[PDB]
Design a binder for these strands. Sequence first.
RNA 1: ACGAGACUCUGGCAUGCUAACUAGUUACGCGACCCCGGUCGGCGUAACUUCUUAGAGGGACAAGUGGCGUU
Lengths: 313, 41, 184, 57, 62, 132
Amino acid sequence: TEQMTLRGTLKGHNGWVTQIATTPQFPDMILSASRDKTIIMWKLTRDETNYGIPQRALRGHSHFVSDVVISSDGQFALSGSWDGTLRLWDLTTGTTTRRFVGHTKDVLSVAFSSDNRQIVSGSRDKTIKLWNTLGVCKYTVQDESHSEWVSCVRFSPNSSNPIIVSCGWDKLVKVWNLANCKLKTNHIGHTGYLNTVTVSPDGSLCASGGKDGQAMLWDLNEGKHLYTLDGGDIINALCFSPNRYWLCAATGPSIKIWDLEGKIIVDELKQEVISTSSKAEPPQCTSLAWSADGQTLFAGYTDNLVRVWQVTI
Amino acid sequence: IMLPWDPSGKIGPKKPLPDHVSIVEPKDEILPTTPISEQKG
Amino acid sequence: DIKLFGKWSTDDVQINDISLQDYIAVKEKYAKYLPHSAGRYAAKRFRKAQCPIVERLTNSMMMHGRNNGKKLMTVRIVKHAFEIIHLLTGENPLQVLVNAIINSGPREDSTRIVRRQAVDVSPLRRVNQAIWLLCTGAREAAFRNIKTIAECLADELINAAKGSSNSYAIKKKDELERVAKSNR
Amino acid sequence: KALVAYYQKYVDEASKKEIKDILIQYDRTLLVADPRRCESKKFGGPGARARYQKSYR
Amino acid sequence: QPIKLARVTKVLGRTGSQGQCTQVRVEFMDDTSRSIIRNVKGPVREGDVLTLLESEREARRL
Amino acid sequence: GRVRTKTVKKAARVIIEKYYTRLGNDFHTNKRVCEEIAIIPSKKLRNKIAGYVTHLMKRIQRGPVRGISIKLQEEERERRDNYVPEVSALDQEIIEVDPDTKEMLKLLDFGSLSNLQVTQPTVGMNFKTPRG
RNA sequence: ACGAGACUCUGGCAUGCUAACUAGUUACGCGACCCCGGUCGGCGUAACUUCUUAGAGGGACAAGUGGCGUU
């Protein structure tokens, strides 16, 4: 029915954006992690010249910051980095409140609870650790856990289900029970390593994308493979629209949005000023997240730029 | 005498030669296509 | 804002020779307050070319052994030289230096390709040779003389920029080109 | 570097970006340390590279 | 004869008894479609201007 | 002089050949792959191997490499090498035939075909390259 | 297969980690001097580890881009 467009580019990174975390509270602000040491808290001015200007840098991690997530309040911000530690940033002042130490290898993913009480951390040591906001590793999964890395973890917005999701490089999506701290069900079928998992705003179904380019859906009510969407390229990051009935995918260079009702592409989003014309790979999209009102889509590529995608019609 | 390598570290040293790159074998894993769950509790 | 040594504001100076225009780094970007800097101009090959010519002069002055690594002492010599140049001529001393570097560089020279045939010079060769010649002029001029280094360095830069052939630099430059014509 | 660090933490990164730019454009060494250190002397010479005078005949 | 300027369009090889002279393809920036091969002392890169005290010699190639 | 030694390349080839599907194009991810799927005693050698792995992965994206094998070998030498056209280049309407090729078909059983255009012979019997 | 490389030590990076009255800094108080501030390797105690020491890690691979090359 329509076509997305760029409003502008956000330019304040040296290393390429590994995660973009949005917030419902502050709409003139976005927080993005990066492949450098920085995590940029932006300021969205919406000018002719610059849509977004960098306000604050959260420096402190030894190595690459792979995952960032904002508190529901918009006062703290949690980041997971390859240094093998987590940071919980005082987002107002721009300093570490708590620094969580326990993971052996590179921490790939981290998430809050909806209440900002529980913290789940996926790392390359084949483990998922449960943290409080005062730095105590309350439980660690070891016995029946992933055979490879924990590439992504997300929570159920549904408080009725004490259920979390975890994709791995073992080519399995595991669903865990928060209360008893051991898995409800496994999800076998997806071939190739998994990069991402996003849980729907409902807390009812979950999309797992990875190497295959096959975004398989997974119902949380009854663990059943609903249907598969063909990305085309490798899938890097998925995100369900908060208000709309749209699933988004970061498929190689393109951002590919589907309608959930009709299993058909709404838009494929690429560069318009193409410079990879001769024996050059386009700068592939790696992380993206829908805005507060489900109007704007922020997307971090491998060229150190955050590109924005607003609805025109 | 050039000693052989043993992780036990009795008959020789415990650190392998810097030249030697021991690559572990990938397990014979079978690729699925079936809708599979494993619910319990 | 505004520059060199206190008082010799860079832009003003025209580099007349469009051949040496690239490798006589004086203007706009290379406007620094001192002839002193960290360095790293002799790490890669042509990085030398992006060094401000007043720092090049300063470096090439500290020679004949006893002066090696007395840079502050030749920062001072060039300071006092630029004083004398401005008072004795009335021009911007940078312009007098640039004009000298242009007029003092030998444009073709002989080499062993027998009786040694003549070849052309690189523009960077000309800048390097020009700086060497007029510094070797200043150094020789002052030795066992009541005249100082800053005076001799000033008088060499004047007589070179002037185009006198009474300078050491212009006489040796004419002498190289004359030998080069003698085998072409 | 200390002012660039002050303008990072205690004002916006826009001022710190603007000032880092103006400093780096002038001279890289204002904000980046030269890794050059005095190289070690070796035997058979008075210093690192230079050797003692070889005698023939 | 006048003193002319030529631009280095290509630096071919390193000739001279001790390899002390770059051998260079020069384009005359006066007559913009006349080009000769020519021996040059000192370090030469592509796109620096030579001052020729005569423009009628032509070096023998590697 | 940044030439990779046999210890780097052999390791880097075997690491791609056995763990192709775990790799990508990013240096820093397959640096950590090489950490897991191999026991490399050096950090420098780990980087060297990870580096050449990534170089060979870019080469495999272009086309097949002389010193490695991919699982199908590889949808082109296997699948596309089963290419079949609509009609064969053999199935020709008018087949041009020499008068002496007509003779050896006449001394065969096949002295009269319908779809053989016997041509005029090559006049000016001149078919060699001159000497010296 | 040895030799080369890998290796070992060392130089350069960490406002990340581990810590310190045989190492500091910063605050605070006291005391000195100048006309609130400035100076103090004058004196002492409250946080921290930037400076200092030395441990564990990380970090660089021709890895990214454009050229040249059996590509």
